[PDB]
């Protein structure tokens, strides 16, 4: 089964700033979610072309950033098996995402371009 868990803009910015991710991050964070994922926890990317696949609500990529359920390499910067963002909770997605956005920015995502430009204040979540 692949049954979503899907978070709402709100319900993940709530669950997001309760994890101690500043707020004015969370607009930024929905949004990536959304264009990412849909909000799902879940959710597993098709292979990228460089052969490359990205995990969870943040579409953490396993070459890099998480370590495949495979033997491959994985950089796995983040110190975590990408299976593991497969679960209820966004923690570990969350998480992994706070290094990647403090290691190289919000431009990591390639859906940052849905998301750069004027959002609605998070606020109304809170």
Same mark, same amino acid.
């Given at each position: 089964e692949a049954e979503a868990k899907t978070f709402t803009r709100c319900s993940l910015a709530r669950e997001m700033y309760k994890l101690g991710v500043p707020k004015n991050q969370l607009?930024?964070?929905?949004?990536?979610?959304?264009?990412? !994922?849909?909000? *799902?926890? /879940?959710?597993? $990317?098709?292979?990228?072309? *460089? $052969?490359?696949?990205?995990?969870?609500?943040?579409?953490?990529?396993?070459?890099?950033? +998480?370590? =495949? =359920? !495979? $033997?491959?390499?994985?950089?796995?910067?983040? /110190?975590? /098996? +990408?299976?593991?963002?497969?679960?209820?909770?966004?923690? =570990?997605?969350? /998480? +992994?995402?706070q290094l990647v956005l403090k290691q190289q920015g919000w431009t990591a995502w390639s859906t940052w371009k849905y998301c750069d430009g004027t959002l609605p204040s998070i606020d109304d979540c809170f």
């Open positions: 607009a930024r964070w929905t949004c990536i979610a959304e264009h990412e !994922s849909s909000y *799902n926890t /879940k959710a597993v $990317g098709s292979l990228n072309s *460089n $052969g490359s696949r990205d995990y969870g609500i943040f579409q953490i990529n396993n070459y890099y950033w +998480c370590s =495949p =359920p !495979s $033997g491959a390499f994985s950089y796995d910067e983040c /110190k975590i /098996k +990408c299976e593991d963002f497969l679960v209820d909770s966004i923690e =570990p997605a969350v /998480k +992994c995402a």
